[PDB]
Each structure stands twice: as structure tokens, then as C-alpha cells.
RNA sequence: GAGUGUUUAUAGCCCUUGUUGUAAUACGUCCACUGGGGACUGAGGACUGCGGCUUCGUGCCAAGGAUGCUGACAUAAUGGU
RNA sequence: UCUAGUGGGCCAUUUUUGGUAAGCAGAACUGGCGAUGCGGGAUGAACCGAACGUGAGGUUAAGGUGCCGGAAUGUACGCUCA
RNA sequence: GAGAAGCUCAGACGAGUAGGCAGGCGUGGAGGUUUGUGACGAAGCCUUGGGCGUGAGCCUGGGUCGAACAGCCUCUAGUG
RNA sequence: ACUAUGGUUGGAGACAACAUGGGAAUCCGGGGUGCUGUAGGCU
């Protein structure tokens, strides 16, 4: 008998994607070499993104690429944008900067802004080849916590969360428990 | 056969000492406390009025808050599998300075001093501190303090 | 088997007394772990001393200077009962020291039920005067003449025909 | 270096002593069993386990 | 290495040769001689995992 | 194995002690008289009760009015039943002593001619006591803390002054003059 | 019978996933302080940042 | 024969110091000192590594896991049911 | 983040309360059974030892070595006739 | 090259009711595929024969039998 | 004194001993019978 405790036994990491896409397959295919044979944490991190369920790889916007890009102190002008997701559009932008965005799917008004614009679409292996290792590229990420499911979760008393409610006006959970003129206030 | 009275099985937790009723010193009105501050929590049991829980009775925290007569110490209590922020405001005639708090900042003081002293001098420090080290090799002398053998003593009647 | 040490121990030196006194004591036990805790066991009922305020300054074996001659050793006592404490007093003759405390051991056990650890070794001597000799059993043994015939035993075993299961004649004595 | 080169080392995975323990294993060393600081002991208990 | 050994070895006669002297001094002196405590210990548990 | 039990405002339906009297002979004594002790003292925890104490109290104070006379013996039980051991009513029943290992149960003084009267009675009356009881020769002067040897040299030197059946001893502590005028024969040592 | 209260598996339940400790902050949220300290500590703040932010901008 | 009453007489014990003598023996500990007997295992499958010996060579070795030499049977043996 | 089962417990050591007592009822700590096979106590849910993939070799724990039953009708000193 | 859903090296570990998860075995029917099996004998059934898998199960020899049946990738359920 | 840990320790039990550790109270005796910060007056 050994007296060991099993606590972190069980890596909660996907090694896989689940998605049965084989061009998914054949880009983790291509940066699973890269992250092997390359010393640079970035082709980590694409590898990893590639595996990453829906939720976890939450859409970005043009608009959000324009301003992280176009900080004061940013130094960001001419270098390459990378996010393993898709890139929406973002019609409250009337004037499209020039950027180059290299991602897993463009949105066909999206793509066609930046065409036009004068910048570039690229996708993960064309980023590869450009930029084997990373250089020069500014890694992104969506908002994950934008979805609806997360204005819900951690509800209960004084949490100030959304209730799951079937309407929504009086009537509705609105009554004894959420203000002081009728019992208490949660 | 079980209350729940706040002051609950406080007889002698909440009494003062023999000998040492009567007058507060004032000594404890004149402590000024910060802060990020560490104390202890004794309850004096002739102020009533910000009487902390008798369960932070004897515990340390630290005091976030300051107000004109009580302070704020922060303390950690098991509830089960965790623990919880509980923020006492309790007047400062039942808070005390750690005096641990005290050592600690003047070994800190020697350790920067022992430190800037070597660094002069060339040498090294040593600002770490040690378990008690096992006895060393010593040479008890025998002269003038000779040995004197023992035997078990024999049972006897001791009434 | 039992050996005889000497050890020799005394409080650890403190502001109050730089010079402590010097405690020695002759012990009976199996190994010098054991000498040194009966060395503790003993001290702590005489002195206000622990082995944690103490320390052991010396030990040593002691063998038999003699232990070609035949000698009368009398050793002194004192043993829990079940009901109280008694002092009693023992004569054994042997080569050593050892030896008559062995003795004494499985005598005290096998007449009394008396363990090691209900049992205080008071004094061991030996007697030298053929009248301080107490146990007339023992004074018996002293006499030059002194002839006994050979005491009963179980026959003479071999380490096979001991083991044989069957003998052709019965034997005789 | 003491620290870091015992920690490097695996604990020692010994058998069981040949010729076998004391008569009760479990009673302090001082009391006759093999339980708690024997000294030199060790050594012997070492070279039957090893 | 060999030469770190070997001078490890020396240390380790030195050191026994060095207690030996002391103890046999100590003893023609008539005086006690008490040595360094031991500052490596090795455990063995001895009682399972119930 | 009960929590002690006292008679207290809680409960005040706690019975009489069947033991009324504890002392038996010449209680007003002196120093000079009753110079041997004779202790009876239980060897183990007991629950001796008062019943129990009533009888030996009686077998002893007839045995030794009847063999020695009133003015051989002083003795005196010094167990005091205090603990209650309930029993249903068919709640306080009667009374107990708690006496633990070498508490003194029974404490006789008498003179050195009488050690084997004292002796003889206090081993009669241990089969009035629940349990195993020892009887022991006591070394002190009496029922006074004093030994022999360390009594006798005070009494030569005349720090004592008999006062009933105890005495007044001489210390080192207090004024001079209340003293000095209540001891005549006190030697103080100049050093 | 009702009224079974025991403990002797609490603190077993407790230990398995032990005593969790609450993640520690940098900063506390200024409700808990007096009302007078967070109002003065806004403006002191606000007055800090201006003074960077000048600083900055000069440099 | 049965008993003395003094210290080796025709015997012999006990206790001190001198040497031969650095006496042996027993015990404890250690030897990267050395001899045999018995049992179970042979996992891996070109080479690479760490070592030792060397005539200095894709040399030899007990050095990152067994090979070699023999014999009997083959309606026997070994396995499976 | 979501959700299952559970929400009748019991035994042993130690500290106890109520009871005449209980294989009784009720509290505290720890280890267990429940959900724990295996070696031992002739047997046994809790006791001792020990926590288990399928096997070979060696050595042990608790426990034993007259036969049943694997192992000394072993060694040394004593006591005991029922 | 080694179904990169692959190859290779190394270390530690292995009780389990209620309960949770994953990977697999078996059945009826549907789509695709296998110059798939079959009156020179399909399915089914019996077996004192053989083989594989830890296992759910599968393949096969012999006897009876006489008209349909199966492997692989998916779909589905009145599936053990 | 008491107490944490241990035994297939003793004892029918109450209890006790032992092993690895911690460690009182009370009594008695010895010594002592205020120290100190600020501001100012004083043959």
C-alpha cells in the first residue's frame, strides 16, 4: 500500500480538437510541427487556440482590431494581426483603416471592407508561412465573457446577476424578494 | 438546553482580571493605529459598547478601516471547507498591537543594517535565520568536580 | 544478554550554575540506548533533571574482572507488586555480575511474576566472607568437600540419533 | 547542498529485513521493538533491509 | 572525480582518526569528552498506510 | 465515575450523613500524651458509604472503649461523606465518601505501649470498608506534620506550647515582643 | 429517533477539498471605508491622475 | 582415628605492582579483500552510450537485458480440451 | 459551469452525560465497516497486521513451530497436582 | 512508410456500494459500398472438435436443414 | 501532581507500572517595600 493523494492526475486539457473538420485537422496538423520544431511560444499558443471550443474562441470586430492597434503608445502600424477565430464586421466604423488581419474566417461584409480599405486577409497557414514563428504579430483575443450565459451565472442573493426569466416586465420576478416595499430586497 | 445569546458562555472569557476592575488605562485611547495595521483582539468586558463576537475574542487581523473610535480589524473564520472575510468594527479599547509585528520590524531594521554593513565590509551576511543546531564537541573537566555515583533508593513509609 | 555499563551525565550548564555536578551510575541493560534511558529514568527521580535539560557525558562498558572465579554476589532490590513496593534480597553465585543479575531476573520472574520494568537493581556486591553469606542454599556451595550427584536431565540428545524416531532398546540409567 | 541533494534523491524503496524484525515490531526501541530512535542501530536494520 | 574522492576519503579517516585521539585523551586525563551531536539522521517507516 | 455532587441550592433534598460523630477518646489531649499514630488508608478509589463508616465507627469505638480504656485512643475518621449517589425512590439517597489512593481513612493516636491494641483494631475494622485497606505506622508526632526526630528536638529547645490537644509552634516570622513575652524557654539564636 | 446531530464526518468533508482560502486582492472595494475617506480619496485620486497625465503629456 | 591451632612445610588459593608485551582471544565495526553450494528470471533484438584492457584496430571484455557445446525422441514428448 | 446519489447509519479506542444495569439511549476526537478483499484471533462487518491489476523468485507483519497444521517433542532458569 | 487517428522512449499507479464519465460487444430496420455469400446448399438448430478476445462476443470443423443472408462507413429504434 | 503519544503491558475491575515528550499549583524559605516623562520653583 502506497498512501498517495490523486488531486491533479487528470490534465483538463483538450490534446484534440472536437471538431471533425479536416481542414481544421490539416492546420493543427501544420502548427503541431510548428510548436515541435520551433522554440517560440506563439505557434504554442496557435496550436492550443486550435482546439478551443466555439465559446472559448469568442468573435472579434475591425473596429476592436482598429483601436487595439491604433493605441498612442502601440508602435502597432504596419504589424500583423492573428486571432484564431472569426472576424466580424463592425458597421459603426464608416471608415476602414488599412490592416492586415490573419484569422480562422472572415465575414463576407468584413473581408470585403478591408479589401477595399487596402489591406489584407490572410488565413493560419498563410500567417504561418509569413510569420513561422510569430514575429511582428500582434495576438488577439474575444470578449469570452460577452455571451449571454455569463450575465446568468453566479446568481444568488445580492449577486447582481440576470434572473433566468420566461418575460420580462412586472409580474415578473419583480415582487417580494427584490425590493424593500414588499418583504426584502434579495 | 442549548442558547444562542451573543455573550453565550462568556463568564470568564469576558471578565477582568483579579485585582484589575475598575479604572481603563488611558494609555489605549492614545494608541494610534493604521491602516494595514496587525492586532489583537481582547474583549474588556467594562466597555460594552463595541463589543466584537466572542469568537474574535484572542484572534489578529488587520485593520482596513479607521473611524473616530473603533477600528477595523479583518479577520478569517472557518465555515466549513473555506474561509471567510468577516470585517469586526471594534472600539479600540478591546485592540491591542501585535508585538510580534513589533520583533518583525526590528528584525527587518537589523537584517537591512547587517546587510549594508557587509556589503561595506566586504564579507557576507548570513540575514537568514536557522533551526536550533544539533550540540557541538566540548570538553567537561572532571577537576574540582568529581563524579559522585547514585544508587535507587530503597521503598520506604514517607507518613 | 545484559551488559554493564557506567554512564556518567549531568544537567546542561546555565547562567545560574556555569558548573554543574557530575551523576554516575552502574546500569544493567541490553545495549547502551537502554543504559542511557534507565541513566534518565533513575535521574529524573532524584534531580530536577531531564533529558532535555541534561546530557550524557560519558558511557562505558564494564566486563568481569574475574570472570574465571567463582564468586557469591548479593543484590539488593526493590519491585512493584500488584498490591505495593517491597525491598528484597538476593544471593546468587557466578563468573560475573551480569550473569547474577540475569539470575536474578528470571528468579524474580519465574517466583513472583515480576517484569523488567517493575524491578529497581538497588546495589550489587559481592560478598567476600564466607559468614555474609546469608542463603544457607548458598552457603552450602562453599564447601570444599562438596560432592552431589549428577542432576536429573532428559538423557543425552544427539543432533540425529536424538531426532531418530525409533530406538531398538530401551535405555537405561 | 544538503537540501536539494536529498531531495534529488528517491526515497529508498528497502525490502523487508532478513531474519525479520523483533519479536513485536510495533513498541518503542527502548521497550524491545523497532519503533523510534535506535542509533547506531540503524546501521544493523540498514545492512538487513538492504 | 577521483581526485574528489580521494579527498573525501582522507577527510572521512582524518575525522575518525581525529575522534579517536580526542577520546583516548580524554581518557588518560581522567576528564569526559563528549562529541559533536549527529546532524544526518535516516528514518525508516515501519508502519503501513492503515 | 459521576460528576461530584454536592449539597447545594440546586439540589437541597440531600439526606442526612448517618455519621454524626468523628472523633472517639480524649479529644481535649496533650502533647506529651498520644505520642504513636496509627493510619487506616484505602489502597485503591472506593465509594465507601456512610452506613459503612457508621458501623466501623461503632465496632472500632466499643473494641477499643473495651480493651484500652477511654484514655488510650484518640481516633478519628477523616472521611466526610460530601458526594450524593443517587437511587430510584421506589434523586438523593444517602451519602458517600470519595477517597482516592492514600487518603487517609481512619487516623488513631495512641501510646507506644498501645501499637498492637491500635494495630489490632484498625485490622478489625477493614472488613467494614468496601475494597483493600493498609495499615500503616505514622512517623510524626501525633496527628501534628512533624516527624519524631524533627518534634522531639523542638520540644527540647521549647518552641512548642501546648494549647488543647494541638500546640502553638514557634516560627520566624512576626513581631518580637508577642514572641518573646508568650515563650520563656525559646532560645533565639543571635548567629 | 429524530434529532441524530453528529460531526464526525464534517471535518473529513471539509479537509477532502480542505480549507480553501479567498483570493487575495490588491485592491478592496471603498464601501466598506468611511463615507468622508472615499469622498476625499475621489477627488485625491482624480487630482493624482491629472498630474500624471500633465506630466506626461509636458514630457 | 577425631579434632586441634600456628601461615606453606611435602600441597595449594586470593589481592598488588616489573618485563616478555605493541601478548593473544572474544566482541563491535569496516575492507571499492577473497573463496564455494542452491534456486528463479533471459525481458530487449544491426550500430551509436558510459567504462576497463590494449599489440592502438571499426581490436578484446563479465561494459545501455543469453549465449555456447552436446544427446534422446518424434503413433514419444510438450502443450489444448 | 452543469448535474447525479445521499440527507435511516453502525463499530472500536479515548473523554463523558442520563440510567440499577443493559448487546441501553445521547454528545466529543480519531480510525474503521457501510463500499474492504487478504494473513491471524478454531468462527465472526468493526479486533491485530495489512489495503487488492495478471504471474515468478526472495523476505516479513500480526500470529505460531506435539498431531490435526507449514514450522525446534529447541536452549537456560524457576513455580504448579487441581 | 508503419491508418501523424501513426511511430518511439521513460516513470509512477491499480479496492470499491449509491452515483458520474469514456471506449467497446450484440439485435431489428434504412442509405452507400464489397465483378460480397448462397440450391455443388442461405438462415436456423445440435455437437462427447479447433481457434481468438481480460470480457461483452466472434470465427471455424462435423451432423440436420432447405431460401434467403452478410462484412465495412453512416442513419435509426418497440435493441440485450 | 497532572497530561499528549504506545503496547496482544499487569490487574476481574477500580487502577497501576513502563517507554517517547510537555510540565504545575500550593506551602515554606531568601530578598525588596516604587520607578519614571514634561514644564517650572528651592541655601
Redesign the interface.
Known amino acids: 500500500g502506497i498512501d498517495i493523494e490523486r488531486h491533479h492526475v487528470r490534465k483538463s486539457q483538450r490534446s484534440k480538437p472536437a471538431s471533425e473538420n479536416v481542414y481544421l485537422k490539416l492546420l493543427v496538423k501544420l502548427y503541431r510541427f510548428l510548436a515541435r520544431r520551433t522554440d517560440s511560444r506563439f505557434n504554442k499558443a496557435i496550436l492550443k487556440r486550435l482546439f478551443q471550443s466555439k465559446t472559448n474562441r469568442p468573435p472579434i470586430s475591425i473596429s476592436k482590431i482598429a483601436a487595439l492597434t491604433s493605441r498612442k503608445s502601440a508602435s502597432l502600424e504596419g504589424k500583423t494581426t492573428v486571432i484564431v477565430g472569426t472576424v466580424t464586421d463592425d458597421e459603426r466604423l464608416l471608415t476602414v483603416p488599412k490592416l492586415s488581419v490573419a484569422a480562422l474566417r472572415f465575414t463576407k461584409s468584413a473581408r470585403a471592407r478591408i479589401l477595399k480599405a487596402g489591406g489584407e486577409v490572410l488565413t493560419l497557414d498563410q500567417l504561418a508561412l509569413r510569420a513561422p514563428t510569430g514575429s511582428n504579430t500582434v495576438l488577439l483575443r474575444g470578449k469570452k465573457h460577452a455571451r449571454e450565459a455569463y450575465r446568468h451565472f453566479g446568481f444568488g442573493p445580492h449577486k447582481h446577476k440576470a434572473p433566468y426569466v420566461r418575460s420580462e416586465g412586472r409580474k415578473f420576478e419583480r415582487a417580494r424578494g427584490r425590493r424593500k416595499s414588499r418583504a426584502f430586497k434579495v | 438546553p442549548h442558547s444562542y445569546g451573543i455573550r453565550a458562555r462568556t463568564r470568564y472569557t469576558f471578565q477582568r482580571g483579579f485585582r484589575e476592575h475598575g479604572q481603563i488605562r488611558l494609555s489605549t485611547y492614545l494608541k494610534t493605529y493604521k491602516v494595514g495595521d496587525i492586532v489583537d483582539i481582547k474583549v474588556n468586558g467594562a466597555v460594552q459598547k463595541g463589543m466584537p463576537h466572542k469568537y474574535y475574542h484572542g484572534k489578529t487581523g488587520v485593520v482596513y478601516n479607521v473611524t473616530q473610535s473603533s477600528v477595523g480589524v479583518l479577520i478569517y473564520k472557518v465555515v466549513g471547507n473555506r474561509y471567510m472575510e468577516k470585517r469586526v468594527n471594534v472600539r479600540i479599547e478591546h485592540v491591542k498591537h501585535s508585538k510580534c509585528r513589533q520583533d518583525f520590524l526590528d528584525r527587518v531594521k537589523a537584517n537591512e543594517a547587517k546587510r549594508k554593513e557587509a556589503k561595506a565590509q566586504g564579507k557576507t551576511v548570513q540575514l537568514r535565520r536557522q533551526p536550533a543546531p544539533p550540540a557541538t564537541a566540548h570538553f567537561v573537566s572532571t577537576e574540582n568536580n568529581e563524579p559522585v555515583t547514585l544508587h535507587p533508593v530503597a521503598y520506604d513509609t514517607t507518613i | 544478554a545484559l551488559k554493564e555499563y557506567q554512564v556518567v551525565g549531568r544537567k546542561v550548564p546555565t547562567e545560574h550554575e556555569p558548573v554543574p555536578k557530575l551523576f554516575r551510575m552502574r546500569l544493567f541493560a541490553p545495549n547502551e540506548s537502554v543504559a542511557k534511558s534507565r541513566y534518565w529514568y533513575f535521574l529524573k527521580m532524584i534531580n530536577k533533571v531531564k533529558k532535555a535539560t541534561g546530557e550524557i557525558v560519558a558511557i562505558n562498558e564494564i566486563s568481569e574482572p574475574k570472570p574465571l572465579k567463582a564468586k557469591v554476589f548479593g543484590i539488593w532490590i526493590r519491585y512493584d507488586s500488584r498490591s505495593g513496593t517491597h525491598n528484597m534480597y538476593k544471593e546468587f553465585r557466578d563468573t560475573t555480575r551480569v550473569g547474577a543479575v540475569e539470575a536474578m531476573y528470571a528468579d524474580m520472574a519465574a517466583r513472583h511474576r515480576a517484569r523488567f520494568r517493575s524491578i529497581r537493581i538497588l546495589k550489587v556486591v559481592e560478598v567476600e566472607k564466607k559468614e555474609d553469606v546469608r542463603r544457607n542454599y548458598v552457603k552450602q556451595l562453599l564447601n570444599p568437600h562438596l560432592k552431589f550427584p549428577l542432576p536429573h536431565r532428559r538423557t543425552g540428545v544427539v543432533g540425529l540419533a536424538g531426532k531418530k524416531v525409533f530406538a531398538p532398546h530401551r535405555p537405561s540409567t | 547542498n544538503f537540501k536539494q541533494a536529498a531531495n534529488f534523491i528517491w526515497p529508498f524503496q528497502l525490502s523487508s529485513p532478513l531474519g525479520g524484525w523483533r519479536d513485536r515490531k510495533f513498541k518503542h526501541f527502548i521497550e524491545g521493538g523497532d519503533a523510534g530512535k535506535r542509533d547506531e542501530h540503524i546501521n544493523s536494520l540498514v545492512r538487513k533491509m538492504l | 572525480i577521483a581526485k574528489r574522492a580521494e579527498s573525501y576519503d582522507a577527510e572521512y579517516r582524518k575525522a575518525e582518526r581525529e575522534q579517536i585521539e580526542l577520546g583516548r585523551k580524554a581518557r588518560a586525563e581522567g576528564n569526559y569528552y563528549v562529541p559533536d551531536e549527529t546532524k544526518l539522521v535516516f528514518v525508516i517507516r515501519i508502519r503501513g498506510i492503515n | 465515575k459521576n460528576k461530584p455532587y454536592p449539597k447545594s441550592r440546586y439540589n437541597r433534598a440531600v439526606p442526612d450523613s448517618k455519621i454524626r460523630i468523628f472523633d472517639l477518646g480524649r479529644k481535649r489531649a496533650g502533647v506529651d500524651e498520644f505520642p504513636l499514630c496509627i493510619?487506616l488508608?484505602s489502597?485503591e478509589y472506593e465509594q465507601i458509604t456512610s452506613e459503612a463508616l457508621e458501623a466501623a465507627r461503632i465496632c472500632a469505638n466499643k473494641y477499643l472503649v473495651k480493651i484500652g480504656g477511654k484514655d488510650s485512643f484518640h481516633l478519628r475518621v477523616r472521611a466526610h461523606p460530601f458526594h450524593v449517589v443517587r437511587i430510584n425512590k421506589m434523586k438523593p439517597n444517602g451519602l458517600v465518601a470519595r477517597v482516592n489512593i492514600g487518603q487517609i481513612l481512619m487516623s488513631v493516636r495512641t501510646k507506644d505501649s498501645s501499637r498492637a491494641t491500635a494495630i489490632e483494631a484498625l485490622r478489625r475494622c477493614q472488613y467494614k470498608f468496601p475494597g483493600?485497606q493498609?495499615i500503616?505506622?505514622?512517623?510524626?508526632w501525633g496527628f501534628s506534620q512533624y516527624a519524631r526526630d524533627e518534634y522531639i528536638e523542638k520540644r527540647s529547645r521549647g518552641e512548642i506550647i501546648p494549647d488543647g490537644c494541638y500546640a502553638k509552634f514557634l516560627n520566624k516570622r512576626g513581631s518580637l515582643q508577642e514572641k518573646l513575652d508568650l515563650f520563656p524557654e525559646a532560645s533565639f539564636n543571635l548567629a | 429517533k429524530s434529532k441524530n446531530h453528529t460531526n464526525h464526518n464534517q471535518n473529513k468533508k471539509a479537509h477532502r477539498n480542505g480549507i480553501k482560502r479567498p483570493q487575495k486582492h490588491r485592491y478592496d472595494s471603498l464601501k466598506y471605508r468611511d463615507a468622508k475617506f472615499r469622498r476625499n480619496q475621489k477627488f485625491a485620486n482624480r487630482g493624482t491622475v491629472e498630474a500624471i497625465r500633465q506630466a506626461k503629456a509636458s514630457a
Request: proline share 0%; no cysteine; glycine share 0%.
Open positions: 493510619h488508608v489502597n483493600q493498609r500503616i505506622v505514622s512517623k510524626k
